Amino acid sequence: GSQFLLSVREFMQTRYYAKKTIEAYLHWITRYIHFHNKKHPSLMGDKEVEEFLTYLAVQGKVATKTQSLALNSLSFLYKEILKTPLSLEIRFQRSQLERKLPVVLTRDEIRRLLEIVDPKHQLPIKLLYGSGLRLMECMRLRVQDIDFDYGAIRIWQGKGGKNRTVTLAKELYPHLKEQIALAKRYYDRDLHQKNYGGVWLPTALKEKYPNAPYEFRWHYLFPSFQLSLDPESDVMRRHHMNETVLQKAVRRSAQEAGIEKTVTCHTLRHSFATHLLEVGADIRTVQEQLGHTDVKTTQIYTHSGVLSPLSRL
């Protein structure tokens, strides 16, 4: 029943799996049992699995990566939940759709992209390229996260609960300060509200620093024009800018300039890494800016002039 899926969700939350990971796994576990007439996975195994996966490939045109997530979700279910791991030989129809090469803009392309973009989104997207931030990393920024004493930005808890310090483009200082000032206004106004629970804080932080939620420094850098009503603990707070809006903002502006390469937020991040490299920065330097734990990962972001030693003999 729907009580088994809830127990799986609880298991994962205790083991502190990422939220997105839980949704991903659940979704594939869900439409797995859904595939079969909702028959309990405990009464199934390798056989039923190597069918769902093949069902995803064929008559599903699922992407090779998509199939992979599913494979892992299922494997998780059978190893961690029902302590009875699948076999490593499960043969199934592997997808065919080959992932298109990572799109990477060019100086002038980006230069023109940052043009036809309304000021309402100029700063955010400039941070995505100027400091190679991820979409949500940029959207979750907080006033205290911007360091003017050193040209840098503190990215707290990025993908996989890792903190990092990234570079900032000095030229944005005036823009940033203005943006902060803009956020200060909403703060000064929202402070005097019948039901303002201040800014949302990471896991049980409001309990440790009950005052933090009402301190400006903890407030989002890019807040929304209105206010929201937080379901948990019926209170209102000023949530941050909408991701989706920024996502299409960059998509449209990308069209309103030419560039027929299908450019999105993460492609601006790729450009950041690519451009730093083309200027001579060291790979490990780029690695640290992106937050990769190992250079070998960054090397998959680098896809002559050497005179043969024989010639110097």
Partner DNA sequence: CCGGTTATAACGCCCGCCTAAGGGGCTGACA
Partner DNA sequence: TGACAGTCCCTCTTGAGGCGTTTGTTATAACCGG
Partner DNA sequence: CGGTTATAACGCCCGCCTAAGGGGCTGAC
Partner DNA sequence: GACAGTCCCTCTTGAGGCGTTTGTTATAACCG
Q: By CB under 8 A, what part of segment 219-258 binds a second copy?
A: none
Torsion of CA 43, 46, 50, 52, to 10 degrees: 20
Q: For the window 71-90, what string marks contact with a second copy as x by the rule CB under 8 A?
A: ---------x----------
Residue 220, both tokens: 């989002």
Of the candidates 4, 60, 167, 283, which one interacts with DNA according to CB under 7 A? Answer: 60
Count helices and strands in the chain by DSSP H and E runs: 13, 5
Residue 21 C-beta: closest distance to DNA, Å: 3
| Site size for DNA (CB under 7 A) | 111
Residues 153-192 that bind DNA (CB under 7 A): 154, 156-162
> Is 270 designated active site?
no
- Given the complex with DNA, which of 171 and 295 has the nearer CB atom? 295
Place of tokens 């019926």: 234
149 binds DNA (CB under 7 A): no
Residues 78-117 that bind DNA (CB under 7 A): 79-80, 85-90, 93-100, 102
> Is 275 designated active site?
no
149 binds, among DNA, a second copy, none (CB under 5 to 8 A by kind): a second copy
> Is 214 designated active site?
no
Residues 30-69 that bind a second copy (CB under 8 A): 50, 53-54, 57-58, 60-64, 66-67
7 binds DNA (CB under 7 A): no
Candidates 134, 140, 142, 219; catalytic one: 134
> Residue 103: CB partners within 8 Å, gap ≥ 6?
261, 262, 263, 267, 270
Instruction: State the catalytic residues.
Output: 134, 159, 266, 269, 292, 301
